[PDB]
Amino acid sequence: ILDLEELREYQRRKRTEYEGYLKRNRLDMGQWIRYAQFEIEQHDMRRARSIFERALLVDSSFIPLWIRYIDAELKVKCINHARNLMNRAISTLPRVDKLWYK
RNA sequence: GUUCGCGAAGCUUCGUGGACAUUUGGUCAAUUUGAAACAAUACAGAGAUGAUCAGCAGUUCCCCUGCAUAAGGAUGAACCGUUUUACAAAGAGAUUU
Numbered sequence: 001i002l003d004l005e006e007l008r009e010y011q012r013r014k015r016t017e018y019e020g021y022l023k024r025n026r027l028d029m030g031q032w033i034r035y036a037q038f039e040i041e042q043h044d045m046r047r048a049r050s051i052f053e054r055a056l057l058v059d060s061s062f063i064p065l066w067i068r069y070i071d072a073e074l075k076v077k078c079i080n081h082a083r084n085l086m087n088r089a090i091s092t093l094p095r096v097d098k099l100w101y102k
Numbered sequence: 103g104u105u106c107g108c109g110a111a112g113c114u115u116c117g118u119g120g121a122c123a124u125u126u127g128g129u130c131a132a133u134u135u136g137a138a139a140c141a142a143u144a145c146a147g148a149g150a151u152g153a154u155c156a157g158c159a160g161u162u163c164c165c166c167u168g169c170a171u172a173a174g175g176a177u178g179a180a181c182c183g184u185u186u187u188a189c190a191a192a193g194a195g196a197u198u199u
């Protein structure tokens with residue numbers, strides 16, 4: 001991964017692969033988090049955010065996804081957004097203990 | 103042009119007022135640059151399983167043939183890979199205040 005174009009090519013390919021894996025097992029939720037992580041690594045915060053949102057939409061009742069997303073939000077010192085996300089999660093799911101605790 | 107009236111010249115001819123009839127067609131403009139596919143060459147090449155082979159489905163932001171809610175398409179196409187956290191409790195040893 002020397003040049004920018006090379007990176008783009010790599011990244012693009014990876015994204016495509018992820019998409020392919022999703023299209024079959026949309027309801028997986030491990031894959032989605034992996035994808036999100038990858039996006040985060042790539043330092044495209046938008047993309048990562050989108051992916052997480054998509055995952056949530058697929059399976060709202062999946063705490064791990066929520067928590068990982070929150071972590072990601074916090075990781076990038078983007079607290080306000082993270083806070084909002086947390087609030088949303090709480091609204092969605094009150095009787096799960098964990099979100100509140102987080 | 104048709105004509106039904108008026109006014110001048112010789113029923114014939116000019117000059118007039120009316121009535122009749124009244125707004126088409128274009129999502130488009132004629133060769134490369136607004137998107138057809140097969141074919142061809144080269145290169146490989148055939149689902150499980152040790153091998154050979156049948157058929158059926160399944161997922162999809164892939165379609166094709168088919169009148170088709172028949173049927174058929176390489177098991178029609180891509181799926182075979184990546185896969186480290188709602189993560190705590192107990193015990194032992196070490197440096198810092």
Ligand SMILES: [Mg+2]
Pocket residue numbers: 177
């Ligand atoms: Mg066959």
